Amino acid sequence: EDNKQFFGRHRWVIYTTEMNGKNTFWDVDGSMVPPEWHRWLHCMTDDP
Amino acid sequence: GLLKKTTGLVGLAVCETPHERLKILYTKILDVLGHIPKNAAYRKYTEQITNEKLSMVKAEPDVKKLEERLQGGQIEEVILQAENELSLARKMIQWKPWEPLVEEPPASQWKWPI
Amino acid sequence: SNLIEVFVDGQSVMVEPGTTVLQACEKVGMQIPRFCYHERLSVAGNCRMCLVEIEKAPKVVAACAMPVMKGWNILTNSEKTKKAREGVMEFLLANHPLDCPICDQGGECDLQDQSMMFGSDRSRFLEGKRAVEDKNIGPLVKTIMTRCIQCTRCIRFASEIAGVDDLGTTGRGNDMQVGTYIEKMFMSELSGNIIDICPVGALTSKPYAFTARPWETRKTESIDVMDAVGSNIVVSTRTGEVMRILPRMHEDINEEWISDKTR
Amino acid sequence: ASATRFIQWLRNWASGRDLQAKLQLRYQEISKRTQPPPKLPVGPSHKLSNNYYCTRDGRREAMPPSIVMSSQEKKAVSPAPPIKRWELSQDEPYL
Amino acid sequence: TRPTVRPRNDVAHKQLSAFGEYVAEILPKYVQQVQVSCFNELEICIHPDGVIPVLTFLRDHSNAQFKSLADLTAVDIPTRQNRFEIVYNLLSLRFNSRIRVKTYTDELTPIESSVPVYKAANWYEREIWDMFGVFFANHPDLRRILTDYGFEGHPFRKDFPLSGYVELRYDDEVKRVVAEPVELAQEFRKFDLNSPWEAFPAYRQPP
Amino acid sequence: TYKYVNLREPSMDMKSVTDRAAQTLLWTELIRGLGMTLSYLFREPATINYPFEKGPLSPRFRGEHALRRYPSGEERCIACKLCEAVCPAQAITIEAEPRADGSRRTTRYDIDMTKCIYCGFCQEACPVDAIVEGPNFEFSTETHEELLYNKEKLLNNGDKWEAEIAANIQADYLYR
Amino acid sequence: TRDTQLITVDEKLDITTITGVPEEHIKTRKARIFVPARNNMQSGVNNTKKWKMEFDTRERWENPLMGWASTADPLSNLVLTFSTKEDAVAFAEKNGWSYDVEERKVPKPKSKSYGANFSWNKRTRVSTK
Amino acid sequence: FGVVFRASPRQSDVMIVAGTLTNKMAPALRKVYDQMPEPRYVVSMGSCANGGGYYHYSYSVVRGCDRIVPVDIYVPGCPPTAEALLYGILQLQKKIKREKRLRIWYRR
Amino acid sequence: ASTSVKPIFSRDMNEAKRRVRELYRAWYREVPNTVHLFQLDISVKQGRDKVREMFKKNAHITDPRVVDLLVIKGKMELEETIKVWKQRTHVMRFFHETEAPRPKDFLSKFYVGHDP
Amino acid sequence: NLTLNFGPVLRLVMELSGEMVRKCDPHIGLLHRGTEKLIEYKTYLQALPYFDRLDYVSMMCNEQAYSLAVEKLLNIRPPPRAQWIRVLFGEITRLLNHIMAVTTHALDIGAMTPFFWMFEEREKMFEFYERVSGARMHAAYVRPGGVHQDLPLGLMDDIYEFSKNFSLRIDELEEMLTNNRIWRNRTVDIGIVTAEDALNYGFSGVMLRGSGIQWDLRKTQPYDVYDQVEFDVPIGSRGDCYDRYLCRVEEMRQSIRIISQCLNKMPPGEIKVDDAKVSPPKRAEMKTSMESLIHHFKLYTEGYQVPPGATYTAIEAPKGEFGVYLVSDGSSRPYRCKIKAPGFAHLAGLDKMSKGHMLADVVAIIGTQDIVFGEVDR
Amino acid sequence: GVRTSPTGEKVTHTGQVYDDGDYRKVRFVGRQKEVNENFAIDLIAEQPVSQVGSRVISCDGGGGALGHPRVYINLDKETKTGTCGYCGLQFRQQHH
Ligand code: SF4
Ligand code: SF4
Ligand code: SF4
Ligand code: SF4
Ligand code: SF4
Ligand code: FES
Ligand SMILES: [K+]
Numbered sequence A: 001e002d003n004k005q006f007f008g009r010h011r012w013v014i015y016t017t018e019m020n021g022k023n024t025f026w027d028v029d030g031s032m033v034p035p036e037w038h039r040w041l042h043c044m045t046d047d048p
Numbered sequence B: 001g002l003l004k005k006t007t008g009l010v011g012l013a014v015c016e017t018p019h020e021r022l023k024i025l026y027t028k029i030l031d032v033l034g035h036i037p038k039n040a041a042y043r044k045y046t047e048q049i050t051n052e053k054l055s056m057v058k059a060e061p062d063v064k065k066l067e068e069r070l071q072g073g074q075i076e077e078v079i080l081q082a083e084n085e086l087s088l089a090r091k092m093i094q095w096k097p098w099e100p101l102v103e104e105p106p107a108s109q110w111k112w113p114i
Numbered sequence C: 001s002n003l004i005e006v007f008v009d010g011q012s013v014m015v016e017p018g019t020t021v022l023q024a025c026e027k028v029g030m031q032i033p034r035f036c037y038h039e040r041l042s043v044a045g046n047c048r049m050c051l052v053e054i055e056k057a058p059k060v061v062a063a064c065a066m067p068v069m070k071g072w073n074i075l076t077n078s079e080k081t082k083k084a085r086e087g088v089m090e091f092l093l094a095n096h097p098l099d100c101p102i103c104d105q106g107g108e109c110d111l112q113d114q115s116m117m118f119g120s121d122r123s124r125f126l127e128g129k130r131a132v133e134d135k136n137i138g139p140l141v142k143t144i145m146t147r148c149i150q151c152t153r154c155i156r157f158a159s160e161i162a163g164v165d166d167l168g169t170t171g172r173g174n175d176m177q178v179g180t181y182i183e184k185m186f187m188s189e190l191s192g193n194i195i196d197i198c199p200v201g202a203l204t205s206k207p208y209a210f211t212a213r214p215w216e217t218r219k220t221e222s223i224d225v226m227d228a229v230g231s232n233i234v235v236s237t238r239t240g241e242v243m244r245i246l247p248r249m250h251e252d253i254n255e256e257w258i259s260d261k262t263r
Numbered sequence D: 001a002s003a004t005r006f007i008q009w010l011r012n013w014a015s016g017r018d019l020q021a022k023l024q025l026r027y028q029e030i031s032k033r034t035q036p037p038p039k040l041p042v043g044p045s046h047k048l049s050n051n052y053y054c055t056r057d058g059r060r061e062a063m064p065p066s067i068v069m070s071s072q073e074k075k076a077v078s079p080a081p082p083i084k085r086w087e088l089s090q091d092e093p094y095l
Numbered sequence E: 001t002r003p004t005v006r007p008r009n010d011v012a013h014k015q016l017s018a019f020g021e022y023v024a025e026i027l028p029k030y031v032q033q034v035q036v037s038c039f040n041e042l043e044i045c046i047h048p049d050g051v052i053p054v055l056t057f058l059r060d061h062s063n064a065q066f067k068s069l070a071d072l073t074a075v076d077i078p079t080r081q082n083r084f085e086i087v088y089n090l091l092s093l094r095f096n097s098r099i100r101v102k103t104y105t106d107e108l109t110p111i112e113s114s115v116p117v118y119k120a121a122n123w124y125e126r127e128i129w130d131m132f133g134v135f136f137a138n139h140p141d142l143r144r145i146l147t148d149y150g151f152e153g154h155p156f157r158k159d160f161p162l163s164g165y166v167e168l169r170y171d172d173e174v175k176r177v178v179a180e181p182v183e184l185a186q187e188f189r190k191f192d193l194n195s196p197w198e199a200f201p202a203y204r205q206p207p
Numbered sequence F: 001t002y003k004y005v006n007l008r009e010p011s012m013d014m015k016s017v018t019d020r021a022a023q024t025l026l027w028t029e030l031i032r033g034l035g036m037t038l039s040y041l042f043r044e045p046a047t048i049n050y051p052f053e054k055g056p057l058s059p060r061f062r063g064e065h066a067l068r069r070y071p072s073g074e075e076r077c078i079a080c081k082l083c084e085a086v087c088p089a090q091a092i093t094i095e096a097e098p099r100a101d102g103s104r105r106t107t108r109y110d111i112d113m114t115k116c117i118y119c120g121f122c123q124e125a126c127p128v129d130a131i132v133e134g135p136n137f138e139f140s141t142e143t144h145e146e147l148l149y150n151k152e153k154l155l156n157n158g159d160k161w162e163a164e165i166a167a168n169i170q171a172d173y174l175y176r
Numbered sequence G: 001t002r003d004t005q006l007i008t009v010d011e012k013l014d015i016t017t018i019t020g021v022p023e024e025h026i027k028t029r030k031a032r033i034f035v036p037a038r039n040n041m042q043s044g045v046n047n048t049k050k051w052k053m054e055f056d057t058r059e060r061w062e063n064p065l066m067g068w069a070s071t072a073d074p075l076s077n078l079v080l081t082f083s084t085k086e087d088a089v090a091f092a093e094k095n096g097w098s099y100d101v102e103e104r105k106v107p108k109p110k111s112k113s114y115g116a117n118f119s120w121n122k123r124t125r126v127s128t129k
Numbered sequence H: 001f002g003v004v005f006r007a008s009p010r011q012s013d014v015m016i017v018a019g020t021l022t023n024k025m026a027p028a029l030r031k032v033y034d035q036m037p038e039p040r041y042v043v044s045m046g047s048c049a050n051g052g053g054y055y056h057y058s059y060s061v062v063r064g065c066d067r068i069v070p071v072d073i074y075v076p077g078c079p080p081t082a083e084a085l086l087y088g089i090l091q092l093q094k095k096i097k098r099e100k101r102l103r104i105w106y107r108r
Numbered sequence I: 001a002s003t004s005v006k007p008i009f010s011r012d013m014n015e016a017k018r019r020v021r022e023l024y025r026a027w028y029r030e031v032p033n034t035v036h037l038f039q040l041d042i043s044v045k046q047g048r049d050k051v052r053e054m055f056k057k058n059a060h061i062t063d064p065r066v067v068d069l070l071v072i073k074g075k076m077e078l079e080e081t082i083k084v085w086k087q088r089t090h091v092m093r094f095f096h097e098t099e100a101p102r103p104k105d106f107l108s109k110f111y112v113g114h115d116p
Numbered sequence J: 001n002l003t004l005n006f007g008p009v010l011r012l013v014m015e016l017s018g019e020m021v022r023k024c025d026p027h028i029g030l031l032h033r034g035t036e037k038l039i040e041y042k043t044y045l046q047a048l049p050y051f052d053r054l055d056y057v058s059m060m061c062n063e064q065a066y067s068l069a070v071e072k073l074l075n076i077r078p079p080p081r082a083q084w085i086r087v088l089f090g091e092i093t094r095l096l097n098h099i100m101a102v103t104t105h106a107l108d109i110g111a112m113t114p115f116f117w118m119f120e121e122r123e124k125m126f127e128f129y130e131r132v133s134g135a136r137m138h139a140a141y142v143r144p145g146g147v148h149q150d151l152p153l154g155l156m157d158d159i160y161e162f163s164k165n166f167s168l169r170i171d172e173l174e175e176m177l178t179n180n181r182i183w184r185n186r187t188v189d190i191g192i193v194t195a196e197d198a199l200n201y202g203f204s205g206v207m208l209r210g211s212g213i214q215w216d217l218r219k220t221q222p223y224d225v226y227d228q229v230e231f232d233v234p235i236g237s238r239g240d241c242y243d244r245y246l247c248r249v250e251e252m253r254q255s256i257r258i259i260s261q262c263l264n265k266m267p268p269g270e271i272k273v274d275d276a277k278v279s280p281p282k283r284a285e286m287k288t289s290m291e292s293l294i295h296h297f298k299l300y301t302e303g304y305q306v307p308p309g310a311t312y313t314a315i316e317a318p319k320g321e322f323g324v325y326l327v328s329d330g331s332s333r334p335y336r337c338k339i340k341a342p343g344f345a346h347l348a349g350l351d352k353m354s355k356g357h358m359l360a361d362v363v364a365i366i367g368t369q370d371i372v373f374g375e376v377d378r
Numbered sequence K: 001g002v003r004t005s006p007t008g009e010k011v012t013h014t015g016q017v018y019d020d021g022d023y024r025k026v027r028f029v030g031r032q033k034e035v036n037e038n039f040a041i042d043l044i045a046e047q048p049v050s051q052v053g054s055r056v057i058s059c060d061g062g063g064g065a066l067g068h069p070r071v072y073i074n075l076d077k078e079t080k081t082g083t084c085g086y087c088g089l090q091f092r093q094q095h096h
């Protein structure tokens, strides 16, 4: 989080390098965000 | 008054003698209406409105004041309409709308809902 | 030669003596709202949804039971008639359950449709509703009796059409209930017809329960072959499957009834 | 907003306008993404009395078209009065 | 007032009624019926022979000046013997009013092209031809405008199936898009929604 | 009221004619355009760093359809077919029967996600908040058949996205 | 008194060749011109006013992928509404469809009397009210 | 990402069918596909190109562009958000990354 | 009377039949050009046979107005072919090269399905 | 002459004599989907999303035209707050369409940079759509009787923040186009339409105001609450592409002017007509009241019956006069829904406007007509 | 409560499973059959019966406006529990 950045770039996720037994070091996907964080990451809410 | 530079409508040129142009057209419409039967509604209604507009042209020299009296926009728009009325009256003579209805509709032609 | 002259909204209509206000309105194409009246049962006059204003008469009359008199003007769309329909509809829906989405009658319910056409559009009932115990009257007719509006069609049909005097009303007042009192099954060769006449979802077809909605079915008009009467039916199908069998009116064969086998 | 004063002057001068007053990027002047719960009002027909539907029924006040003429001295008329001429804007008559 | 009901405009209902009689008197040879709806819309129903006379009068007459053709379309009512209803929507910027002109025809009877009156009717008439199969005589260039080349049938007719009769597909054997009889994996589900109870007694038809 | 956009007469005094001559010969107005794009070179770009940054959405966002449950695990859907009757694209297919315990439940609940127009009418019409459109918008597939959801896929979505669907409904149920 | 010059055409109206319909769906089909029967679940009679024309039902099979109902019949969903029997037969004849016309079934007028529920001697007396 | 805004069809590597494919337009779309130099991929964007969408039951709509051309990625939505389409392009990139053209050639 | 009706172009069959032949000659002379421009895989003779077959199916018409429409539509079809508004796919839709023949005998129908 | 078949969704079959255009013949129908025939199979609520997808750059102005037509037949009136929301998002939509019209027109004739500046503004306006409806484009938010839901708390403050800066964004667009001689060379004296030709060819919108005709349905035949807002109608003088470009850019400035007044004059109240036989009740009362559940059930399965009748209702959509001729038979499904797309009459006049011009001018003329083939073909 | 057929395929909560000789099983070769593991009929049986002290109880599913339409359940019959028609919860009357 960085609230000095403009809206849209003020929240981001650095994806894990391994999820569900898949190597995601270079292969990252937007669907890897779990639903609880999906809401906070897309600014549907202010409370993580 | 000083002649306007433009009418504001593209393709509609400014007329330098509006009063004389309208007197001719209105007097020419009345002449064509004389060939229509007296009882025809088009004769009675077109002569009535034409005379009122012609009365205003002869009764007011100022163009700006004439335009407000006629309520037809720019005077060049009044002239154009008088040309459309004149071409209409000539065509009505060939159509002869004042005659009885050509044919009746079927029994339920204009019934809604079905 | 004995026809009398009555008016319906000013239109003159000639009616045989003994004709009711409801019937006279049906000769000009107007269908008075009704819940308890069925033209093949005896008159009951207890739902009060047919109340209509007779011009110059202070009191509204039950159109289903009032024989029309000479020179009456039947105001089927006056303010007095329309306010009488909303009051009666308001009372019918006061204790009715919020069951439409789980109720098999939804989409072909006379309580729904007449509420949309003649009733109000909201509620002022701020109390708790009535709940009623269910009765098991066999394997063919499912009974959710909290949906019953106490119209007594089933009682009259069983008593008059089917000849079985097993249905009736036990109790009194708001707690009056339709049923058999004792644990008994309404097993008759014409029992399944009480599903159709019942205007609400109180009586529904147990085999047909939950399988389809009325708007999605295709209706094919055909004949019954289970016997030699030749009853006219409508076969409801959806997506190439047969869903239910309904009667079809033929005045000379089966009226609007069919037997349990046919159904 | 993170641009230094020098680059701010350069962008401002090249454009000719003070860009820092009206930035196209949204910083913390927009509404919070979690707002307090609302409580919306009810309409004019939410009443417990004097609210019969036959008195506020728009659909049943619609009528079939009026037949002014059918096949089954007087002054000439127009569909409506002539349209009033428009008035030049007092805000910015000429762009 | 009554917040949920559309307010009437009796002034505009009076004016349109007067102009309807005006038009009916000036063109008795064609006008068959004039009516004003409860929301103040004037309809002039005419014999199809009057398409050019009636439209020309409304376009040119000093008290009409209906110089815009807003729309021109057709409605298919199969129960009438003249199943098609040709509708003209005209606009008058001088008097800030609209008028609707209706006529009729069948599958074979031509209608006169109103291109000489309104140039905007060039494409509207082609769309009517393409979608309903109504032939407009003396049209400068009459041909399909919306349907695929070689399309058979007129889709907007009430008896034309919603999904048509043919569907396209690429065949690898012949290396081109081909047309074949339509087969839907899921048939369109026909819903019967009409309530069996009358909604509007003011429109009840006589028995 | 109205205004004229292009009804001004250029001045013919010698200074104004020379001001226009300088513009033509010295390309002055073409050089303002260069200044306006040099300005944008030194503005921060509006690009976000997808997929590590996401575009903002709201609780009303209409995404992948999903079937929900009560807090007890019982399905909310009671096979009423109001969603099926209102779907403008006719994308919902429902079949139902009495469940083993007498309950009113669907045996089929399919949504053709290639017919669906993602309009949300179904979740408007459902009286029990069973079918909803979740917040997911990243479910692109490699075959056409993966977009024909059946009751298992939709129930799986509900179990998969309930934690976020429930909070989106809690944030917006008072506007509906 | 039309000015347009008319011509005489003495043949039954027939438009089968200018409708675009495949020949398979003009000769093999069977129109049914009827007044829909009242839905026996409701007492409303507002769907029994107009005449309908529908066509003969054909095969619907189960879609292998999803179990959906498939069809190869373009006229399966086609229903037309007509004011009268005659103008419904007229439409069928000019389109070339063979048809069956079923006469309207109107309920017989009934003799209803509330007082009969309390008869002195007759059998119409009711046991419960 | 390296995805130029708009390339000419003869320089193009992927075709995005974004909208309703009507019968009148179907042969034109096939011709453009046949003229794409290989390797060529197709992305079906939206419900109209996926399966006809809102106009599935129309007489003049191809029920899915996958009756005319082969499709590699289907992007659902009406319309898919610009981010959903981007998620589908990044999925096509991941799909190219899994190709084994030389392994198949080697093991032939 | 009832049988009085506006003509489209032709006031009787004799005048209508003239327009049919004028259309046939226009179509007959464009098959070689159509088979060349569109690079069709059919011969000119079978292209002219299809023209003949189309003129033959609706050869029982006796209403002059129906004939005029069939000619109006036929000219529209010819114009699309000559102007090359059509493509190779549209010209070949007259030949139904991709759908297997539907047998017309009763027994063959009886085995395959319920249709008559 | 040389015949060029500029295939594709537009197919232009032009007849060129050297570099001049002697005849332009637009071939359309490449996006004809049978919308009007599909609407006949839908209830009135089910046919609403079909109108987002006609002029798919002005989505919420198409819904308003349909809603005004059904409301006219229904004889109901949407509540005052619903009308201010419909005039607020009508002008936000007009900004969306005019950005797509000017910048795509500029991109066609070479100027590619203003497209990217303004499509960031479109991205922020797509968020207003998504915060009231949940969809960025096809909101299906304006409905017969009002709007679906009420504005969420915090939206109007976000609309204000966007509107403060938007004039500066238009000024940057004008620094690239208005005085640029290359742009003036591509647009000035190109595609001139006389005021009398424009009326007879069925033109509407800036295709008339560009020729000096003083007509705007928002002021001559006002709908909703346009009679309570103050704005100016930009009028051209030469009838050419350049004057039409200046009318569109000036209309964006007036749209911001109207948006400023909607935000201040937004009233309280409900957002859909308080008549549960037309507009569904709130979910809270659908789950407690018997009447409400009945009316919810029937409004979402059968729909509301509309009295028999026929209306031609029109609005001043950003492209021009958008209207519908809607025929009701008394049932819950429309009998006929003819859609009057303004571009259909405009594109029909491309042949006239292209006479005496070169091939590269046809690209500028199509841009100045603001053609979207969702509405041309329907 | 996912049961497995003799061939090995999971039975869905609707009772669906392909027979042994059905060719449509070929769609799952190299892929999987998606079966929801949480059977609703089993989870609503785990909920305890609620003891109330009145003849008529009302259920709205819990959550107020977030539940289901409010219905009233009659508990006069002592040989069975009163089940909610929307959500399956059961109620019983205390010692009567
Ligand atoms: S009987 Fe009718 S009103 Fe009562 S719950 Fe069933 S559908 Fe609803
Ligand atoms: S069960 Fe049905 S038929 Fe019997 S009284 Fe109740 S509502 Fe009437
Ligand atoms: S969102 Fe719209 S299209 Fe999708 S399933 Fe729901 S109602 Fe149907
Ligand atoms: S999802 Fe909702 S609307 Fe659809 S059938 Fe289930 S309960 Fe009814
Ligand atoms: S946005 Fe929706 S309706 Fe429009 S083209 Fe895409 S899928 Fe079709
Ligand atoms: S129908 Fe008359 S009281 Fe029931
Ligand atoms: K029942």
Ligand SMILES: [Zn+2]
Residues within 6 Å of the ligand: K059, K060, K061, K068, K084, K085, K086, K087, K088, K089
């Ligand atoms: Zn419950």
